[PDB]
A and B are shown apart, each in its own frame.
Chain A
Amino acid sequence: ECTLRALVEEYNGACKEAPKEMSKQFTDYNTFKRYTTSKKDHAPQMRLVYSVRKPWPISMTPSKEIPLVFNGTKLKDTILDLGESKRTRANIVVPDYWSKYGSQTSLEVVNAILYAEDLKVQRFFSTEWGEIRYGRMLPFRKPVQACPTIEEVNPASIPHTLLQVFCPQYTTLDSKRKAHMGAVEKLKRVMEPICKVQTQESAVHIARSLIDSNKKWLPTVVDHTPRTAEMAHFLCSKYHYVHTNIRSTKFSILNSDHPRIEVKKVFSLSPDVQVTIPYRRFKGKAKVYFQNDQIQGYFSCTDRQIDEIKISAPKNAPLLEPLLDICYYGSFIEPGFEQTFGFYPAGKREFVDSFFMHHSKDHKAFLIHMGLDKDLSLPLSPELNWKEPALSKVCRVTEL
């Protein structure tokens, strides 16, 4: 195939011309991706005026669509710029020449590149403003998500979600588990026409922009939403204010001998600094029926130990985080309720997030507390997935 042949030829050329640089470690790419002698960022405001008026003031990769002379004007130069492997100089009118006498692209490609920007423009030209009300407003800066997102994602799951969007085959099971399936398909659908090796560099940035939730410090007079945060520069000020217009599971305790007891626990950072965080716990016997999208089932409750669990799930459907929530409400697994993760926590939000990440990274606690057996009739595997060929299946589990 043509692209594979070109890749082979490029690899051979890299081996031939640059043998020393190709013998470096792969992790060095994080350093030599930026290895340049250019200093085009050392106070460039003082050089703009006479640098765009200088002969050959631009850098252009060699191409055939650009004639040497167009209507008496020398558009491009035949000499490669120093320090640049595949770029030469040209006249400043080449950007203007391309705007009319240039090649075209697909309409879908234009929309893909102009996706986030057009979404912002539509959001601006899609709402009805109020009447400017003047007064001695008191604006206070608060951390608010500035740019609206297609779907809420954790800051740590963004790289994994992007890897799933672009390179689902060059990823691990852990990275797939840490992804945010539910927003990956939207990005794939809206990004497909541009997911090419030619434009993968520019696609990752615009895909992150739709998914990143950077928390900027912005003035406010009323509690902003993600929508009314990117526009805070003209909706609120010191003088005017225009008025614009467990995780994901259901518990259903159902049958229960006693209600959820709350054992308040105090973690002592110091004799003088202490943190009090209570956890919900089931006492005695209970029968709780859960549901998560297409997976459903109910489990028995014997003190803080999971007596037995049975589920109905599609075949080869991941089930790690649902059973992690199941362990969360009931406090069936530790550490995460009684003893710390080696470091004393600060708040319940941080504590619950850490409980989620630590146990999603390693589910050994669930297996060791839950039950394992040597047979084949058991539905799940040590990896917490539904029917599959595997060994040492998780005991004390039946079908529903």
Chain B
Amino acid sequence: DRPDHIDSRVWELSETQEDWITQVHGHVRRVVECWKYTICCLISNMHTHRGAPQYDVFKWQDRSTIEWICSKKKVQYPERDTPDLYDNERAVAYKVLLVSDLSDHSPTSGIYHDLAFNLEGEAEESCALVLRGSQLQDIKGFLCRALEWVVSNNLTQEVVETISGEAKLQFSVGTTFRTLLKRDTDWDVIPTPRVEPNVPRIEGRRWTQMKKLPLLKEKEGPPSPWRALLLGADSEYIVCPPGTDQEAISWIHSQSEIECIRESKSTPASVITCLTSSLQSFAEGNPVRSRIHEDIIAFGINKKQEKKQSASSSASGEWKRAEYQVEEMSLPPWVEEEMVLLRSDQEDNWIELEKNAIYTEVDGVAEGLVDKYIEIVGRTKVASVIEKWQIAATRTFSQLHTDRSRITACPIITRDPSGNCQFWGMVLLGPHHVKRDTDNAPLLIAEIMGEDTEEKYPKHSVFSLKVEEKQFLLSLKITSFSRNKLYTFSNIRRVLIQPASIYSQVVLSRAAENNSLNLEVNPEIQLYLEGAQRGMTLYQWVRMILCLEFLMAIYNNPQMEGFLANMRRLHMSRHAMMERRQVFLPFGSRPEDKVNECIINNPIVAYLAKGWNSMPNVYY
């Protein structure tokens, strides 16, 4: 596209000086700028005085070296108005300014002495004086030779337009792109609908008042089992002589007898050999052990191939759309006993968090409230269960190489203040190659029980454990736990924050009303317990809030998330009516239908729904 009368070097140099594609007649402007650059480079063609070239060109040079040369000359030129070329022989600057009229002798600027040509060669009189005759002849030649190019390509209007004014932005959509754009719309690129602007008057429906709070449905079916990974409230520990983890696992492996009381079909009783081998290996000193014949059944090794082969063998011949059904199970009766056992009082503090520094009395107040909260919710079964969950999750996630093909043992061992070891159970990591966020790592968790149920633990195989005349119950389950869930249960201690937030709000509000912090307040809080309005003391309330939050966290399925999201609205409406305020709804507004869809099989959502529907539904 380069004109033959323009040098290739100056063309490639001017290619990117200014954006020529988004300018009105950008090609003509580029040609004009190439004209000016060829005029200035054509000037000072081997011309020199002293020991340096007579003229220095500033157009289209790096601005850093331009400033350097100007600093050598002890003169400063701005960017928005910089001369074309500077003459050091006469110590004056110049700018090539092509003008068609040639009668515009008026200087464009006073900083630099301007020079002009008439587009066919003739220069202004001072321009003729300040330049040598050979330079004038060369400019004549270039202007005439560009004039034939202008005439041949009939651009005589665009050239004068560009040398007259400045650049104008444009953005043009071609004819081919326009049709493709307009393929799928009735309107054109610039929508011009031929309709009179007005707002129609549309008739709607009346707004109804929600006189009574919605009643959540209660599904009917078999009781829901314990689907959590660990055991929860029905989890106990074995006291061991003080020492390291291996020094306790060896003690357990030596002084114990294992017999099967219960054998579930989900977890065969033959997987106990894997557990015994894992304990033996961990006792010897190597936590990681090789595979055994029972490990295939224990961790489902090569189960995908077997299931695929069986499915290929068993065929029907319809190829229908897959319809996945989710079984509906009612509220199990063990939720209440779990909530009442998780609130029981232990003897030791099970929340050991390192104290923060205290430099300002604001922190001393802050750490006092945290210490009191830990005192309230530490000596409690739920705190011990949170602890055991955290060790079970972290000692597996951390030693989850995430790329391994051998069985790994991760004991769940804690320590009491007296130093005695506490063997809650063992987690057996299996061959895992999880990459996606939905991949499941095979697990075989053995856990110490307190009481078997067979309607709460249907997939758990219960074994009888005898250690120094003491009879415990050992439960083995086969689970597959994803990396995301292991990650989120490694930070299970975060659940303490919400009841801590509630307790902090209560205490700080009491301090605000009394204008003084007490930190020993035990407020009486009224609640709808067993239907009637009874009261608690914020100590067992916060404790059972902690237990409920822990149960919600370990049972956090999409059903629970949707139920809570659609239940916050109903709770807000309950608050609104409790303040003698009336609630109105649009026409087809049934806010309980978005909640009833999330009550399917989760036990905690059923417990929450039963708690909701036991409350008064109308506030007179």
Interface residues of A (CB under 8 A from B): 25, 45-46, 49-50, 53-54, 125, 129, 131-137, 169-174, 234-235, 238-240, 242, 361-362, 367, 372, 381-383, 385, 388-392
Residue of B nearest to A390 (CB): B111
Q: Produce 1/0 per residue, B340-367, CB < 8 A to A.
A: 0000000000000000000111110100
Residues of A within 8 A of B91 (CB): 389
Judge whether B78 and A134 touch: CB under 8 Å.
no
Within 8 A of A (CB), among B78-115: 78-80, 91-92, 107, 109-113
A135 to B483, CA, bound (A): 46
Judge whether B487 and A391 touch: CB under 8 Å.
no
Judge whether B362 and A234 touch: CB under 8 Å.
yes
Judge whether B110 and A382 touch: CB under 8 Å.
yes
Residues of A within 8 A of B209 (CB): none
Min C-beta distance of A247 to chain B, whole Å: 22
Judge whether A391 and B362 touch: CB under 8 Å.
no
A361 to B361, CA, bound (A): 53
Q: Produce 1/0 per residue, B508-536, CB < 8 A to A.
A: 11011111110000000000000000000
Residue of B nearest to A362 (CB): B80
Judge whether A50 and B110 touch: CB under 8 Å.
no
Judge whether A50 and B401 touch: CB under 8 Å.
yes
Judge whether A45 and B365 touch: CB under 8 Å.
no
Within 8 A of A (CB), among B186-218: none
Min C-beta distance of A27 to chain B, whole Å: 8
A381 to B78, CA, bound (A): 13
Residues of A within 8 A of B394 (CB): 49
Min C-beta distance of A65 to chain B, whole Å: 30
Judge whether A135 and B80 touch: CB under 8 Å.
no
Residue of B nearest to A131 (CB): B361
Residues of A within 8 A of B365 (CB): 132, 240
Assuming the A-B contacts A49-B398, A136-B513, A391-B111, are A383 and B78 also in contact, with contact meaning beta carbons closer than 8 angstroms in the complex?
yes
Count: A-B pairs, CB below 8 Å: 104
Judge whether B360 and A382 touch: CB under 8 Å.
no
Could you show 10 A-B contacts with beta carbons less than 8 Å apart?
A45-B487, A50-B398, A50-B401, A129-B362, A135-B512, A137-B512, A239-B509, A240-B508, A361-B80, A391-B112
Assuming the A-B contacts A383-B78, A391-B113, are A134 and B515 also in contact, with contact meaning beta carbons closer than 8 angstroms in the complex?
yes
Q: Produce 1/0 per residue, B470-487, CB < 8 A to A.
A: 000000000000011001
The size class of the interface chain B forms with chain A is 35 or more
Partner of B512, one of A25, A50, A136: A136
A132 to B512, CA, bound (A): 11
Assuming the A-B contacts A133-B515, A134-B516, are A392 and B111 also in contact, with contact meaning beta carbons closer than 8 angstroms in the complex?
yes
Partner of A54, one of B362, B401, B517: B401
Partner of B110, one of A174, A385, A391: A391
Judge whether A174 and B487 touch: CB under 8 Å.
no
A133 to B517, CA, bound (A): 9
Residue of B nearest to A25 (CB): B16
Assuming the A-B contacts A25-B16, A134-B517, A383-B111, are A239 and B67 also in contact, with contact meaning beta carbons closer than 8 angstroms in the complex?
no
Q: Produce 1/0 per residue, B60-83, CB < 8 A to A.
A: 000110011000001111111000
B400 located at the interface, meaning its Cβ lies under 8 Å from any Cβ of chain A in the complex: yes
Judge whether A132 and B362 touch: CB under 8 Å.
yes
Judge whether A134 and B512 touch: CB under 8 Å.
yes
A98 to B212, CA, bound (A): 69
Residue of B nearest to A53 (CB): B398
B402 located at the interface, meaning its Cβ lies under 8 Å from any Cβ of chain A in the complex: yes
B235 located at the interface, meaning its Cβ lies under 8 Å from any Cβ of chain A in the complex: no
Interface residues of B (CB under 8 A from A): 16, 63-64, 67-68, 74-80, 91-92, 107, 109-113, 359-363, 365, 394, 397-402, 437, 483-484, 487, 490, 508-509, 511-517
Q: Which 4 A-B pairs have the closest CB atoms?
A: A392-B110, A239-B508, A134-B511, A234-B362
Judge whether A49 and B78 touch: CB under 8 Å.
no
Judge whether B517 and A129 touch: CB under 8 Å.
no
A171 to B68, CA, bound (A): 10
Residues of A within 8 A of B511 (CB): 134, 239-240
Min C-beta distance of B194 to chain A, whole Å: 27
Assuming the A-B contacts A169-B67, A171-B67, are A46 and B487 also in contact, with contact meaning beta carbons closer than 8 angstroms in the complex?
yes
Min C-beta distance of B82 to chain A, whole Å: 9
Judge whether B113 and A172 touch: CB under 8 Å.
no
A300 to B107, CA, bound (A): 29
Partner of B487, one of A49, A169, A172, A382: A49
Partner of B80, one of A53, A174, A391: A174
Assuming the A-B contacts A45-B487, A49-B487, A50-B401, are A242 and B80 also in contact, with contact meaning beta carbons closer than 8 angstroms in the complex?
no
Partner of B515, one of A53, A135, A171, A390: A135
Judge whether A391 and B402 touch: CB under 8 Å.
no
Residues of A within 8 A of B79 (CB): 172-174
Residues of B within 8 A of A383 (CB): 76, 78, 111
Judge whether B78 and A173 touch: CB under 8 Å.
yes
Assuming the A-B contacts A49-B397, A135-B512, A173-B76, are A372 and B110 also in contact, with contact meaning beta carbons closer than 8 angstroms in the complex?
yes
Residues of A within 8 A of B437 (CB): 46
Residue of B nearest to A177 (CB): B78
Residues of A within 8 A of B74 (CB): 389
Judge whether A242 and B514 touch: CB under 8 Å.
no
Residue of B nearest to A124 (CB): B359
Judge whether A173 and B77 touch: CB under 8 Å.
yes
Residues of A within 8 A of B362 (CB): 129, 132, 234-235, 240, 242
